[PDB]
Amino acid sequence: DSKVGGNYNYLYRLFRKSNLKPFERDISTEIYQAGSTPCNGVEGFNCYF
Amino acid sequence: IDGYFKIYSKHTPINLVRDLPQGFSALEPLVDLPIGINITRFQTLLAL
Amino acid sequence: ATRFASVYAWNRKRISNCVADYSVLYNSASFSTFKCYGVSPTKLNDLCF
């Protein structure tokens, strides 16, 4: 699973609104709003993929 | 104790020439310093 | 502050014996970067140090 220059085939969820329930799966790609400011579907301050 | 330096006090009127007076009086908590230093000795400060 | 330190002589101020409100910082939106390590930026306001 590794290669020179780095393999990026594998992803992991870095941000979520709440912890997953047992054996739960979440494939959503909606930009996470960490702050009070809305993200309008684009990355920005407190708005990260 | 428990990570603090803790102080209690009370002041009372007396009329005596010498020695600690009789009777009961409970000291109230004064201040509760969150200070971590080690202490093993002390000395009194006096006004000339 | 009007003048910051040179990075070779980076200033340190101790913050203590006080009540914080990190939400005022995090919601300021004045900042280009706001990264927290080990502590979540949101839960930071619900915690003591």
Next chain:
Amino acid sequence: PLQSYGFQPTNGVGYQPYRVVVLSFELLHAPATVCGPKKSTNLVKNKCV
């Protein structure tokens, strides 16, 4: 050993000055000299709450 930054306002953003503040929090058995505000609710009476 020290070199000065040349900050002209017309420089590219990678060469422009950035201010940084790093907040370092320590968690210990020592007393909590700093804590967050723990924002209160209104107070209500004569009801099971």
